[PDB]
Amino acid sequence: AWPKVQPEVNIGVVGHVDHGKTTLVQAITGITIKLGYAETNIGVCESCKKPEAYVTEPSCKSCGSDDEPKFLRRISFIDAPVLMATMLSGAALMDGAILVVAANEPFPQPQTREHFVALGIIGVKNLIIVQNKVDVVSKEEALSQYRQIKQFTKGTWAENVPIIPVSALHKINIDSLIEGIEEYIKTPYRDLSQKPVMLVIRSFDVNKPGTQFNELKGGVIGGSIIQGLFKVDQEIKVLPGLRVEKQGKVSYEPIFTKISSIRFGDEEFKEAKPGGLVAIGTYLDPSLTKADNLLGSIITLADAEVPVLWNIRIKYNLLERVVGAKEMLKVDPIRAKETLMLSVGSSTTLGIVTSVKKDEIEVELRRPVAVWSNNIRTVISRQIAGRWRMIGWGLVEI
Template sequence: MSEDEFQEALKKQPLVNIGTSGHVDHGKTTLIEALTGVWASRHSEELKRGITLKIGYADTAIYKCPKCPPPQAYYTSATMPKDGKCKYCGSPLEFVRKVSFIDVPGHEMLMSIMLAGAALMDGALLVVDATKECPQPQTREHFTALSIIGVRNLVIVQNKVDVVSKERALESYNEIKKFIAGTWAENAPIVPVSALHKANIDALVWAIEEYIPTPRRDFSKPPRMFVIRSFDVNKPGTNAKDLVGGVLGGTIVQGRFEVGHEIEIRPGIKIKKDGQEVYEPVYTTITSLKTGDQPLEKAYPGGLVAVGTTLDPSVTKADNLIGNVVGYPGTLPPTLYDLEIEVNLLERVVGLDKPMKVEPVRAGEILMVNVGTALSIGAVTSVRDNVAHMKLKIPVVAETGTRVAISRQLAGKWRLIGYGFVK
């Protein structure tokens, strides 16, 4: 892809995914709203309970004043004046790029969903509540998850500074510095904000621009997308002639998709064959591509893309195809019912109030694995030289070297204990 093509794509769709992570109730969804103007938790149960249950998403564009110094030079679509001019000097604001924010749950029981979201992240905002001691259990767990998945572009957001004293804000800052000392993130910026009052958001946008760049991907590879949502977008009572096909939502990780092309979805849907339940790939045609409200003829890696298809909407409704991988027919990795993983265990279980040593993986135990956006549970059939063999309940699509997050059930809850690589 030429530089001109890259710049043109940059104007039409986000080419970078920025996740929010951190403990429940630290203000991640409120922060995304301050940045984008969009409340990312859209599910009815989320609105009722006031917490994130599914992966949310929201896009925005970043603008910069050509004359003012940072941080006040930076704006987003949600914070810029309606006339498109800098509120300090009146200069017309210049477009920088579009970005996509991924909102993941902070609750300990939803860690598997957070791991699926982390698989899509090019960078992350680790949100810390200044009113509470750092780290909270899921602050530590989410930071470990980012480490395992390989996210290395990080901005730490010290939220709720509007409701603490100056002394507590400084104490909170020092707690954060101590938490990240000696880690890959020890030099990450810490930006104090009030997401609720939208205070210091310009400084946060500046830090995002400095520390979370748009990655350059290989557009020449066969296209591949991880599915994170799937929908039936037809409203009840729609006439049969007006029905549209099912929609897949996710992120393209390589190559590019185009309207009109045929695609394969793996592992696909569950069917009965010879008396056994197996998964069969699904084939369909792309009828539309969209990012936010922007229709596309071609969709590139990064950002969250909605792919319209000719599938029966019953196949995609209620997130039925979460965890699937999409590509052109014949280009996808194999569907694996048996998984061989080179295991790397953490020293301690994260996410608990009290430290607990991670015990070795044992034959016969049940583990949960996250592979891309796919989640599966399987029985360990054998372990030798840190290589575990698993029989999966739900197959995954992966090639050699794919990173896997590993969790074990402890006290009735799945806890992150390590990571591995598909052999």
């Protein structure tokens, strides 16, 4: 039999807005935290020819065997599908990505180029480009577009990213994409001695109306573990935590609790490791978690030492220019007193630039951020043409 395990890797699925990517995830996977999330086992029939040997079910009958296929791993997918903070937050969780382009449209469409740039900015370079709808174009046209994509990626960091033709709607060449995911989006090395850190992207009150008071469940926190591992009954804390206002005053107080349960999808586990979206039951007053109240927080063990900072120094890199409709837009150098949006983990905060140098800026934040490690990546955005746009990235320096 195949084991029942949590997913060990997260794969972003990004597309020009389309009828493509979601059906893609469904074509691979057959499918509370949501956000366009799906999991699937991946396996391979050892005595059979690739790529057809790749399977998502423990059967090799399709290649003429009654034997059980080898289990490789369980993977999860995160669908990109607007407000800027959301892609940034999703991007925080990805170990790799699939960029979906339509084979029957000129490459690259504006949104596609935007996506490519974005993927470069957020640091997600385990990439696969998927030519969707190749069944509506000839071999020759698909090859033409293939050549255009290679030409567009040449000289860039994505010069060698594979291009895989499929039809999501009609399920053509899906196994080649599964093979591609296995070869180009390997599960990263995990040092599980690292301090446990989880990014929170949802929080719920899971109690239904009419729930009897003595049967009330504590708040539930949904997120993505990025390092280390958590266990049921561990003492943890939520950082920066609870916003508290004394008259004419503001501050944040860590929220202490204990893990009551760990869940991936509909399977319960005793422990939770990086990979997949996890639901964590707590002993918290559900008021504290209700309606994504804790979105943008992190969770660590109670005794972890983690700086919570209202001012940060960032070693940064700006783009030369930003994709726009209908045109490319120049990126002005950072200026003091200007407002930027900074993405750190699953959080997004406005800040004022208090210092500008060539390689470093310093920023005063409207809300503090928990900085769990040195050189955490941050995404930098500026309001251009009345819309927040990613203009560069950096490392938070502590």
